[PDB]
C-alpha cells in the first residue's frame, strides 16, 4: 500500500493528475492533495465520490505536512505553468521551499518534479536535499514523460501505427533543443530526413502548439496530467516490486551533464540502474552535442540558486 | 462502425474532465468533437490530441456548435454554470442547443448534464417537438453521478468493493427527488439510521462538495467521471451491446412525464423502459413525497419553451 502526494493539486495539471490517479492507482493506495488554494479539500471531496478503492484527502492552508507525511511518492506540480525569467522567479523559490520541507518530512520518498523549468528545478531540489544531508539521487526525477507520449502520438500518426504500442525513446532535457527524441531507435519504423526534422521540431515545440490553439489563454494541462500519471504509476509499480523501465531526467553517470534524461530501471529504492541510451544516428549525435551547453547552463542556474 | 461523440461545454471543469476520460476510454476508431463558447476550446482539443490513444479529436470555439454536432452519434451537454438569473441562463443555453441539434443531428442520442436536469431535459424535449424531430428514446438526463456516489458511500460504510457494489437510484436529479434504492443493495443490511443518513448524504452530496470548495466551485471531476460512464454506455449500446443504465427519461409516466429509472439501451437509444422493482416503505414515502417537486420542475421547463 503506497501513498502518493500531489503538490499543486488545485491547478489544471494537478486536477487532471489527481483524477487519473484516483482511477488508476492500485487498490488500497492512498492519495493526498495539497495546494494553498482553499478549494483543495473540495477537489479531494469531489474525487472521493468516485467508486475506486483509493482513499483521497485534500489540504489547503499554509502547511503541506499532512500530504507529505508517510508519502512514498511526491509529485510536484506546484507553481505556474508555462518569458523565461518570470516563470523561473516564481517556480524556483516554490520548489526550493517544498524540497526543504520534503527533506524533513519524507526524505525517503521518490520525488517527481513536473514544475518547470525541469532542467533547473530538479537541480534546485537536489541541492536542497544535499544541504539537509539526506540526498538520495535514486529518488529524484524530472518528469519528462510528456515528451515521450507526444513523440509516441506523433510517430504513430505519421506512420499509421497503433499509438498504444509505439515506443519512442527521448533523452536529454525537457525544453527546446534539449529535448532529443531518438527516432532512430523506433522499432520497425523508418523515417526520411525531412520526417526526422519535422518530428523533432514539433516534439520540441509541442507546448507552444497547445498555447497557440488556446489563443494564449492556457497551456497543456490534461496531457501533462496524463504524462505525470503514467510516471507516477511507474514509480508505484516499482516500489511494489515489479521491474519497470522508464525515461526520466535523473542524476546519472554524468557523461554529458550532471542531470540528463535517459532510460532507467526502477525498483524498490527508485532508480535501480541507470541504463545507457544506446546507439545514436549522426543527426542525434549532432543534436546532442549542440544542446549540451544549454543543458549544462540550465543546471548551473539551479545549483547557483541554492 | 466508429462513433462520434460531441461534448458541448468542453472548456469548463466538467467538460475538460469528461473530454480527458473520453479520449482515454472511447473505443479505438472513435471521433471526439469538443465545443464551447470559450476561446480556449480548440487548444483543449490540441492538448488532448497529444495523448497516444486511437481517438481523433477536434475542438471548436464560438457561438455556433454545428461543426461538433455534424455527424454526432452522441451529444453530451455540459454547458452553462453551477439563482433565477442562473436558471434563465442555463435554460436559454439548453434551449438554443436543442434548436441547433434539431437541425444538425436529430438522430443523435442526447445526454444532458447541464443543471437543473429535472427541468433542462423537458426544455430540450419541448424544443425538439416544435422542430418536429423529437424521439423520446434518444433524450436522457444524466443522473449517473447520483449512482456512483451511492455506490461509493454504501461501499465505504459496509466495507465492500466499491467497483462491485450496485445501488439503483430513481426519481429526479436534485434534492428530495434523488431516491437511492438502498433496499435493493445485495449482500448488505442497513439499519434505519443508516438508511436515513445515506439518503440525506446522497441527496445533498452536491452541497457537500461546494462547501468543501469553500463555496467557489462544485463537483467537476466526479461529474466528468459519471458523464463518461454514461457516454460510453450509449456508445456501446449504439454499437450493438445490450446495456442497462439508470437515466432520467420519458418513460411510462407512472409518477412524472420524465423520471429516472433503469432502461435497456440499444441501437436506437432507449430499447426498453424497465421496472425499478420493489420499494421499501421508506422508499415509497420518499417517492410519494417528491412527486409535487419533480412535476413542478418539469412544468418549469415546459413553461420556458
From Swiss-Prot, chain B:
Substrate binds at residues 83, 115, 149. One of its GO terms (cellular component) is cytoplasm. Its EC number is 1.1.1.37. The active site is at residue 173. Keywords: NAD, Oxidoreductase, Tricarboxylic acid cycle. GO terms for molecular function: L-malate dehydrogenase (NAD+) activity. NAD(+) binds at residues 9-15, 36, 90, 113-115, 223. Homodimer. Belongs to the LDH/MDH superfamily. MDH type 1 family. This is Malate dehydrogenase. It comes from Vibrio vulnificus (strain CMCP6). The gene is mdh.
